[PDB]
A paper describes a structure:
Magnesium chelatase is a conserved enzyme complex responsible for the first committed step of chlorophyll biosynthesis in photosynthetic organisms, which is the addition of magnesium to the chlorophyll precursor, protoporphyrin IX. The complex is composed of the catalytic subunit ChlH, the bridging subunit ChlD, and the subunit ChlI, which serves as the motor that drives the entire complex. The motor subunit ChlI belongs to the superfamily of AAA+ (ATPases associated with diverse cellular activities) proteins and, through binding and hydrolyzing of ATP, provides the energy for the thermodynamically unfavorable reaction of Mg2+ insertion into protoporphyrin IX. Here, we used a combination of cryo-EM and functional analysis to investigate the mechanism of the ChlI motor subunit of magnesium chelatase from the cyanobacterium Nostoc sp. PCC 7120 (hereafter, Nostoc).
Our 3D classifications revealed a class corresponding to a pentameric structure of ChlI, which we attribute to an intermediate state of ChlI complex formation. The map reached an overall resolution of 4.9 Å and differs significantly from the hexamer maps. The ChlI pentamer shows a spring-washer-like helical organization with an opening of approximately 45 Å between the first and last monomers in the complex, which would be sufficient to accommodate an additional monomer of ChlI. The resolution obtained for this structure allowed for the fitting of α-helices and β-strands of ChlI monomers but restricted the accurate determination of bound nucleotide molecules. However, the cryo-EM density obtained contains areas that are not occupied by the polypeptide chain of the ChlI protein and are close to the nucleotide binding pocket (insets 1–4). Therefore, we suggest that the ChlI pentamer carries at least four nucleotide molecules that we, however, could not unambiguously assign to ATP or ADP. The three central monomers of the pentamer contain partially folded insertions and generally show higher local resolution. In contrast, the two peripheral monomers are less resolved, possibly due to the increased flexibility of the ChlI pentamer at its ends. Of note, our pentameric structure of ChlI also contains nucleotide molecules bound between adjacent monomers, supporting the model that ChlI requires ATP for oligomerization. The oligomers then grow and form helical spring-washer-like pentameric structures, potentially representing a resting state of the enzyme, similar to the Lon protease’s open helical state or the AAA+ protein RavA, which creates a mix of open spiral and closed planar ring state populations.
Author numbering:
A (entry chain C): 14 to 93, 102 to 124, 137 to 332, 338 to 353
B (entry chain B): 14 to 93, 98 to 124, 137 to 331, 339 to 353
C (entry chain A): 14 to 76, 99 to 113, 116 to 124, 137 to 176, 184 to 331, 339 to 353
D (entry chain E): 20 to 46, 49 to 65, 142 to 153, 159 to 174, 186 to 194, 204 to 214, 217 to 219, 221 to 330, ...
E (entry chain D): 14 to 65, 109 to 111, 141 to 175, 189 to 285, 290 to 309, 313 to 330, 349 to 353
The structure:
Amino acid sequence: VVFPFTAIVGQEEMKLALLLNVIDPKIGGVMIMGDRGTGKSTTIRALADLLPEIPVVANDPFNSDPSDPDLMSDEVRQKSEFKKVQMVDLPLGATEDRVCGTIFEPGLLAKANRGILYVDEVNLLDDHLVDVLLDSAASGWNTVEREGISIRHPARFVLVGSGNPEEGELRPQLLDRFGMHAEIHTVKEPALRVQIVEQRSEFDQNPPTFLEKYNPEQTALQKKIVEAQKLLPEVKLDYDLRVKISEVCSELDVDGLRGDIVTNRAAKALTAYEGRTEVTVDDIRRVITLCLRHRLRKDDSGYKVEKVFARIFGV
Amino acid sequence: VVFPFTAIVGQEEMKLALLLNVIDPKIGGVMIMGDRGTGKSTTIRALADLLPEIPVVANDPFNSDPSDPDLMSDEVRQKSEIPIEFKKVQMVDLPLGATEDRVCGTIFEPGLLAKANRGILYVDEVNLLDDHLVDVLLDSAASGWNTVEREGISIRHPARFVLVGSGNPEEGELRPQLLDRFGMHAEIHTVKEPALRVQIVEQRSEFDQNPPTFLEKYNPEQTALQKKIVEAQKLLPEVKLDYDLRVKISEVCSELDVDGLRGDIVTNRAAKALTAYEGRTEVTVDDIRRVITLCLRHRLRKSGYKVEKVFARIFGV
Amino acid sequence: VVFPFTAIVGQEEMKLALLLNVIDPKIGGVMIMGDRGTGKSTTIRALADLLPEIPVVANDPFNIPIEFKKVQMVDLPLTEDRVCGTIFEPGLLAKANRGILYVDEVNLLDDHLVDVLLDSAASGWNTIRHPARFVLVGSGNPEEGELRPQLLDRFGMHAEIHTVKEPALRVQIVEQRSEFDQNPPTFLEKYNPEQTALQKKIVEAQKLLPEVKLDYDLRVKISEVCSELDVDGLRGDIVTNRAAKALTAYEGRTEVTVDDIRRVITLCLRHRLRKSGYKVEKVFARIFGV
Amino acid sequence: AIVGQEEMKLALLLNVIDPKIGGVMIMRGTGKSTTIRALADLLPLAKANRGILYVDDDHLVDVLLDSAASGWHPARFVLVGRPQLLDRFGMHIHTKEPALRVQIVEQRSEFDQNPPTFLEKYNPEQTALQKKIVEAQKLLPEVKLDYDLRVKISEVCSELDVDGLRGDIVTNRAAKALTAYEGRTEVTVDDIRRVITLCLRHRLRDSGYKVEKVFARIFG
Amino acid sequence: VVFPFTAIVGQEEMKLALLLNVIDPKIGGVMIMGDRGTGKSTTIRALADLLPVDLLLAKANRGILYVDEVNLLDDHLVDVLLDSAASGWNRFVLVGSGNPEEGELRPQLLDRFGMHAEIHTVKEPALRVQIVEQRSEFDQNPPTFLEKYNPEQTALQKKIVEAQKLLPEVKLDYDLRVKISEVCSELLRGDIVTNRAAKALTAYEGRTVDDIRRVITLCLRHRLRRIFGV
């Protein structure tokens, strides 16, 4: 009851950005920054059936797999269904109590453990969850401050928001502390856009029929991700190239130590869709722009990074 | 009894705009700007008294569509018979500064979002209105089903109703983020000939004269519109659009700076209603371009002559 | 009993306007301002007596043999369910039927609560369908604020009391009031003959009202005059037409002449006048050429 | 129970025989209930069909205020106690010489220690006061006010800026009501000057001095 | 739920400065500059730095507090905590934390910053990259990762634990105090703590004027806004 897998073709790099956040949860997140809404909610919801039916336990508000004492918060840890993903968005008008529950009264974040908490126009929210939500992912749990009550039930999510350049982006406080940064371009190919309208008509002609048109293609895309689960083991680079990765920043590593460490793990994922068991050279260059471009403070951006990348690796 | 559906005597363009939206349920957003809310209320009554009968089944509060679609998974699906029923149109307009809980409901108590299965929803002086529940209502246009989850609830009232917008310009434009989802938005301008309005004023007195002879005054004229609209309803699927002409449509909006082709997408579908009204099956390039330009004026962020000048040499001039 | 209608001295403009609304329900409505009414209730109690008895409230608790009820009317309240009704329990909006109520303390009132009054003209029923055809008299308060960009624009005969000194007149009024309050006995007879003639004239005018005559072609001048001003929601022509009809069925002249404009320009235009009287009169004279 | 103290008692006595006049709006007061009890001494809801009530707006009080003129279920009650609520009033003390305090202290000792057998101290005046009230009652609906004098009275409103003028009508009737205990055939400044600012301080828009200065200009 | 304090490296003097006021009850908040992804990590590391809040009064007696550049924080406490600093009673031992780009606090607060600390940036992350790998090693089974460094961490509880019960064995030299007047008094109230600082500084290890000379410029900038013959 949604758009197809490769729907709204064009955000191929964006599809890759979404894939980058997938599989590996240590990336941190993403910040959608484009011209307008453009119906990006479908692109946000494009990973609806993409998530497998992760195993379920009982029917608690928090989405929890069975067993896993590390994932058992209060009752399952002392007590002794393969539910679909439930990624949700964040209402504009909201309060801190709305993101919690006065116990045991739960909260929206707690009920959405291990999910893609969608968000858009984050520039509107001032301070309520600017650092509270950013730091929540690192903790991995939802602590309570209700006097004696202090339940710290585990909290897991994806934490990838969105916003519009018109209302600004942020006073830089946790933007470096946030995940990778990316944006969107302007579609100038009317013929390509014409097929999108045809694709919309294809989506409108018969949702189920259209689905049967590319149903086998949908299965193939999910196949690489499932096998990529085992790809996390090994892939141990000699770190000899990673030695120069820090030296690559140099003038561009003025501040944000934390950021440099994180980009290193990206290469393993970068050399994971390609299937290479060893470290693939030039993949850092393919991810250098998507690494700390927004985090790189300034007054040629990518072009300047590319010019700097010439001395960093040698080309 | 209400004033005649042919008592508009003006705003032909606004009248034409409202009729096309009636024909295609997925047309989009409809709104009218101006300084005469009473005029919008007048059109509201005229629009309400501008449709054939619709069937219900027995008693369903939200909607009792007699087994037309499979969207009866609620109680009717269990019951899938007291179904020999067919009601008429019914408008709906929420009071200003209403209650969100009343707008939503609880559990199951039905909220204010339980009006006609389609259309009916209308909003006068929506320029002020409120920020909360407005985007949800804008999103409710494509919702197709309610979202009830209070205290762990789970219910989805399958309703899909069009909306009509009205608000005085003195209150200012809405938020640009919320300003989107505007399929059609225009304004109505008066004339400096009270003499001409005096006829309608005299007609208003004739309208206020007696309900007798009021229906017989234009019943044959009124019957023509019902037959023409119903005729296009059956032939609506037979729509022919030229891809080469369709290619020009995006090329037409090449210098539009739409900041998102969402508006241009449904803009192509706009000419379908004009073709259905015309009766011609093949797309007429000129008519299509004109309709698209007229509809895109509201979404054109930054007059229509410049767009018309832009339309010149784009569609071919 | 209360003070007689003719016993009231002053506010002749208000008296002329108030009678028009009762004369024809078509009348849009009057609105009145002016702090320190000092008898505002009596100023409206006059219309209560001036009404022929009609068969009303016939064994129906909504207002077999039919009793020719003389008259009935309330003024105003000090809950919304109490204002309308309950579910079938009728509320305060269940007695104004075939009557009229004042708008006392509407300067404060309550937004989104006093709106059913505007949404009450030509109701014909309720929504439980209780017919409603009540009249309304606006009672505003000066210096108490006027937040009605177009909310009170619905007002038709907008006027207010503007007495200044009237020293000898005030003394005479006070003396007459004291005399009337001392003993209504024979105070009724002091002016009894006058009320009957007025009641008969009003009844005759109401009876002959349907045979009114006018001329839209002649009213083209009024249309042009309205065009000279600025309007947004119209209804000005309707107000002018109703005022002209009342003026025709106010002196008995079964025709149309250019005097209703001079009689009711202030009463009609000022209600929706742009945000004065002298300028409106000058414009009307220039348009008419007089 | 207190000798003298006619600064505020005189208004109460004048209003005692003025059922048409109404509106007690006070804003000393240590006696409070005791002062009310002192008022009940100089006197013989449902049972209040013919009586007086004391006040210790909204819904009940606002309805109670209009129930004065709408004293019919007959009420006929005498009330004791924003600009809109100010209209329901026609009449609106002082707690410093130690000599007054010494007399009060001695009276307080006389009252508290000698609650009994102390009636004869004020009984001769209080008992005779009933005849004075009775004498004023019989001739109450007999006196009249001069229209030529009323012109001077009406002239007071010219400089006055308080709207409504209902109290002014009452004030014109107030002077005629007064002087009944006095027994004089007509009413001189005695009734004019004293009762001028008596009700004027309540519905006022130098609180009294300016009014008195205008009154002095208005009066001869 | 703990991290090895000694695992982090760089600006090790700050940890000693943190260790200087770790068991000091008459010290109070100490200024510490250097705000970045690092500062947050170090603060969390400070919490997990030794066993036996930050930026509620009953559960606050005798507790440290990590500031967050209070210049940008609420002024209600700023107008109060500044005077509440060294108030005497209702206790707590906060720690001034922030950055020049993150604010400069208040001038009275600037006039009394206690000990002054800062954190700089160093290139050639030879050890930092290994620390990043150690953090990755810390990421890989943190319950087991801490166990690898646990024996070293285990041999740290009694490093200075018994060095504070009988720490005030001696007192600052009177002649040394007069020598402070040449620079410290010539260029106050903060000097009184610096005067007894050497007793606190040279106590944890096994109980010297070299530490005092080193600590001479440790908090000079906090009061500035050779004396010991150096």
